[PDB]
């Protein structure tokens, strides 16, 4: 329950996977609408630690541009260098990308990004004891989500092709 | 030794031009300018006559003009010719030659 | 002196390739990547023509191409050839040769 | 006596050797159950000071993998390097290990690790005036335990093959 | 110059092995390991061919293999051969020879 | 060059022994041990064969064994022979000779 603002009561059913965090740079808006970045059948790059340099970010964008699909970059943060590369590729010829930070303070995000990965199907990069790096990515290593909405304060992934037989195992893990 | 447009290096110096800036990537992506640093591959355009240190006869420079070379990282003086930046190194400092 | 793929080191420089990364151990365990440092054992692939310092005739490099050598720890420049990192040392800096 | 939470009274008999300290990395869980690492007929590596480098930790794991038995690593702490080696060996092919810090806080841990060693049968590494190092270990230098349970807050060793004729001498020492 | 087990130093380097660790004392007492440092007495096992600096002909190393020598304190590189630590010094750095 | 008890210095090194400790004074008083420093007067007992630096033929050491010399203050390595501390200097570092 929250303190509403209208005169009546309202039931809002937040559906899918939504977290209270929006895009970083206000240049990814391709909607011509109420300040939204809207993708369909997009890739997902889930990184635990920051994407600092132009080196680490280039292979994922290469894969995305080769396959010609949009890309969301859910990471701890996008440094100014990779951010500048992303914005540059966006404002000219038109690679479809968008970037967002992680959901939770320090420890919760390490689990929540893994949940997002297995819900969409992929691998979190930069994990402590997994030794997965951004430089060696592959098209089967990126998550796939049907529809993505990113406004200035919240991101929503809706349809993650994430192998439900394994998200069910995750659900059992978290319920136990 | 051979000269360039109204310029001639002294006793060892080699005047070279750095190669392209590498704006875009190999496959399909495109890069900014604050990154990418200074390219280490260059072409030699001016060569000093010969080495002062050599006793008696001068020891001529080994890198001949028109070659591609792998420059070092630090050593080098910025000269401007015709509003084009060229870099003067010493012949000992040039790492490798791209022979092919 | 002998060259490499469109590359040829200058006077004393020698271009070598570091050996394997040693991912797993001898017996049965397996190791991470942040550890294990840089392998000091390498193979020489490119050799400069001769030593500039030698008076008159050039003094040729002694480590010949195709040998295994125990590299030093610090000295060395990183070159990239065909998207493979090779390291250019000086011939004096190469510690030992794995003759066998 | 403790402040219970249920409506009735309860008698809880903590059996074996239990200390209020759980596993470090939440990747050692091989239970598919209530967040437990459960071993049977495991080795025990008791270290007084930290296990920092990959060098010191590798021979014990070599012995464990050769004999093909699980391993518990009770030490003052497991540094990030040895921790990463352990987690890497765990998440791939499947060496059975688990690590925990020491029970005591000061000198009491220096006594309690020795008690655990002689109760399971082995040698505490890093002792002040004993000159026992991790690099030179042997299969008779590791403790042996029948059953081990490690949850997120407490570790329990149950059956230590520790030469009861000597643990009795220890008991006489402590009673005196 | 003479080699060792699949190893050979270059131009001056000498591969020696430090002597025993001196665990116990002379009379009857025994010592720890954090003490006793690194023993300065060693035996030479590998010797480089000859000195690069010497003009024309190479100047061969003076310490011959199989000798005992009083090593210096600081200078020296750690090499590992057959899982045994050997130390590579320069021939100028070796203080004295235990001739007897 | 001449050797000592199972010891022989390398090219320029010279092995000397410092003189007495000067416990008491000249007239009638006596002194402590924390004072009086290290005596600078010594006797040469071991001498290296010759100077490596000399081109072609080796240049033999000038101070011959059995002489008294005024040692410098800083330079010198501590060697232990037969549980007696001897000091290895270089021949250039020895200040003067007590000829008489």
Author numbering:
A (entry chain K), D (entry chain L): 177 to 352
B (entry chain Y), C (entry chain Z), E (entry chain 1), F (entry chain 2): 3 to 102
What does the paper say about this structure?
For the ADP football (stage IV), we conclude with confidence, as a result of the high resolution and quality of our cryo-EM map, that the nucleotide-binding sites in all fourteen mHsp60 subunits in both symmetric halves of the football are occupied by ADP and Mg2+, with no evidence for the presence of γ phosphate or K+. The specific amino acid interactions with ADP and Mg2+ mirror those reported in the ADP-bound crystal mHsp60E321K–mHsp10 structure, except that in our map several water molecules are also visible. To this end, we built a refined structure model from a 3D reconstruction at 3.74 Å resolution determined without imposing any symmetry (C1 symmetry). The conformational analysis described above showed the unsymmetrized cryo-EM structure displays perfect symmetry, indicating that in solution the ADP-bound football does not display subunit conformational asymmetry. In contrast, the ADP football has lost the left interaction locus, and the double mHsp60 rings are held together solely by the S464 interaction. Concomitantly, the equatorial gap has increased to 4.6 Å with the buried surface area diminished, consistent with a football poised to split into its two halves. Further, when we superimposed the ADP:BeF3 and ADP football structures, we discern a subtle but distinct concerted pivot of the ADP equatorial domains away from the interface plane, abrogating the left locus and giving rise to the single point S464 interaction. While density for the complete GGM tail is not visible in our structures, in line with the fact that this region is predicted to be unstructured, we did observe extended density radiating into the center of the ring for the ADP football. From our cryo-EM images showing abundant ADP-bound football and half-football complexes, we postulated the former might represent a pre-split intermediate.
The group I mitochondrial chaperonin mHsp60 and its co-chaperonin mHsp10 assist the folding of mitochondrial-imported proteins, and correct misfolded polypeptides resulting from mitochondrial stress. Like GroEL, human mHsp60 can also assemble into stacked back-to-back double-heptameric rings capped by a dome-shaped heptameric mHsp10 (GroES in the case of E. coli) co-chaperonin lid to form ATP-driven nanocages for a substrate–protein to fold in confinement. Features shared by all three structures include mHsp60 protomers in an extended conformation along the molecular symmetry axis with clearly defined domains, namely an equatorial ATP-binding domain (residues 1–137, 411–526), an intermediate hinge domain (residues 138–191, 375–411), and an apical domain (residues 192–374). Each mHsp10 protomer adopts the canonical seven-strand β-barrel structure and exposes a flexible loop sequence of twenty residues (mobile loop) that mediates the interaction with helices H and I of the mHsp60 apical domains.
